[PDB]
Amino acid sequence: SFVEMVDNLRGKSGQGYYVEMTVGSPPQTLNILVDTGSSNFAVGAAPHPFLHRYYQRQLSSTYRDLRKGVYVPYTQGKWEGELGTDLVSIPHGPNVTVRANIAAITESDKFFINGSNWEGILGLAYAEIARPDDSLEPFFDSLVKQTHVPNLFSLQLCGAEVLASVGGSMIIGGIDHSLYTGSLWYTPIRREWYYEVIIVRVEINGQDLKMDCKEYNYDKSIVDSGTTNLRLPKKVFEAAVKSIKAASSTEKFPDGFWLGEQLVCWQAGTTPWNIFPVISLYLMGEVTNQSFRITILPQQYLRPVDCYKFAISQSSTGTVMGAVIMEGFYVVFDRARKRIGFAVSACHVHDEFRTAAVEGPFVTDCGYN
Ligand SMILES: CN1C(=O)[C@@](c2ccncc2)(c2cccc(-c3cc(F)ccc3F)c2)N=C1N
């Protein structure tokens, strides 16, 4: 039952959310980043300065070598490992054990994070973007094929001298109605690689950015629990920042802040949330000319570091709806029906004049790549 999966996620602000897993026999306990933006189950499997524990294949009686290496250079860094399979469970998840592919990371650069408290990544996206190629079955595919767990999972990410601690829930194989209020609205998964969606309109304090919607999805828009910020294509970013600056003009900030590098501080409970506007993303609906909107507050896009960082930033690889977006909502990754549902989260942070919202329908191609 889903009650035992509630609060099964933990994290530090800006360093992702992780779920506890065990790998091998006897079971080796590891904290694993829940990542909808990649498709490899990849776990530290050798000593590293930021790892205080790692996967030791030699200690597992059930480990099987696939006799194949994997090398994954990526923009910000890289990881490299060796492929194999082993038994995998999620203690506070479905009561099942599955044989899954595991990339045992032997070498990496700027991949692991100092103090994050996770030792690997659970890529929940689709085979198309798996490394080295799409023949390496992702964890969730193996889980569904090997067990009777329904082809669906949902994420409630709650957020918040030491980085603030965050919590949330990953409900595997269904939807926990206690985790949200109001209605669930669904946007189609445009293609099964990333969790790609289409944004058809963007509003800052009710004011339409009035861009050709192709810009919003140039060259794609994805939902990514493995990204902290709301990331926007350059032209949309600039337009968004312009509008946000204007709405909050009363107070004045350094452009280092708007560039998401500098933090700004008020002291304990004086933060002027009301001076910052709400942001609405309209997502394509299940019905052609129909859309719905998710609206987030400054409490979501200014993330605590008294002090905050502007968690909206520029992207050259399309829109990324990261934690900043997801923390307002209960997000259903309905793989079986090729759609992503959004509803107001029971845990989303807000005040007594505003609240995050999911609302539809609104009547309204925008697909780019
Ligand atoms: C964009 N993106 C990545 O770059 C990657 C990844 C996955 C697999 N292969 C290459 C890159 C990743 C790797 C490591 C850490 C983090 C990370 C996650 C957080 F939530 C916060 C801070 C972090 F640094 C993210 N996952 C995703 N979605």
Is 111 close to ligand 1, i.e. is its CB under 6 Å away?
Answer: yes
Q: Look at ligand 1, atom 12, and give the residue with the nearest C-alpha.
A: 226
Q: Give Cβ neighbours of residue 177 (< 8 Å, ≥ 6 apart).
A: none
Positive or negative torsion for Cα 38, 42, 9, 153: positive
DSSP, collapsed to helix, strand or coil, labels residue 302 as strand
Q: DSSP label at 275?
A: G
Catalytic residues: 35, 224
- The resolution, in Å, is 2.1
Length of the chain: 369
Question: Distance between CA 132 and CA 277 in Å, rounded?
Answer: 43
Question: Nearest CA to 115 among 61, 149, 71, 165?
Answer: 165
DSSP, collapsed to helix, strand or coil, labels residue 336 as helix
CB 154 within 8 A of CB 175: yes
Q: DSSP label at 214?
A: G
- Strands in 230-233's sheet, in edge-to-edge order, are 196-197, 221-223, 319-321, 230-233, 312-315
Experimental method used, please?
X-ray
Is 322 close to ligand 1, i.e. is its CB under 6 Å away?
Answer: no
Q: Look at ligand 1, atom 2, and give the residue with the nearest C-alpha.
A: 226
Q: What domains can you pick out in the chain, each with its CATH number? A: 17-149 (2.40.70.10), 150-369 (2.40.70.10)
Question: Distance between CA 10 and CA 18 in Å, rounded?
Answer: 5
Phi, psi (deg, nearest 5) at residue 324: -50, -35
Q: How far is the CA of 226 from the centre of ligand 1 (A)?
A: 5
Substitution candidate for ligand 1 out of 78, 121, 129, 196 with most atoms within 8 A of CB: 121
Question: Distance between CA 140 and CA 146 in Å, rounded?
Answer: 10
Is 74 close to ligand 1, i.e. is its CB under 6 Å away?
Answer: yes
Q: How far is the CA of 115 from the centre of ligand 1 (A)?
A: 15
Substitution candidate for ligand 1 out of 35, 76, 105, 139 with most atoms within 8 A of CB: 35
Is 119 close to ligand 1, i.e. is its CB under 6 Å away?
Answer: no
